[PDB]
Design a binder for this molecule. Sequence first.
Ligand SMILES: *[C@@H]1O[C@H](CO)[C@@H](O)[C@H](O)[C@H]1NC(C)=O
Lengths: 49, 48
Amino acid sequence: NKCVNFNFNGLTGTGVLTESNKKFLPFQQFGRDIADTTDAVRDPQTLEI
Amino acid sequence: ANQFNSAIGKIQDSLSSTASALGKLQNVVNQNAQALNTLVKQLSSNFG
Ligand SMILES: *[C@@H]1O[C@H](CO)[C@@H](O)[C@H](O)[C@H]1NC(C)=O
């Protein structure tokens, strides 16, 4: 809910993180917007979206 | 007066019945949305 710089697995970006109801299936780790920019991520230390 | 009242009745029936009657306005809203989407899609492109 705070804005941050973030880096997940070398995906550097800037924004506010939020707990998501978007159910990634176990094979996925990043979600992408119509713009080809990431809009969701699975944290590499707690398996949560 | 009865002809005028009946002709105004037919306008409500027409607008309740068809979708294409407002095509001249829906085309403008559609072109604004399509032009915005095309501009967002060009963020996906590598350009080399
Ligand atoms: C590493 O992450 C796992 C979950 O993938 C967690 O259960 C574990 O406690 C973490 N390792 C350590 C040393 O705490």
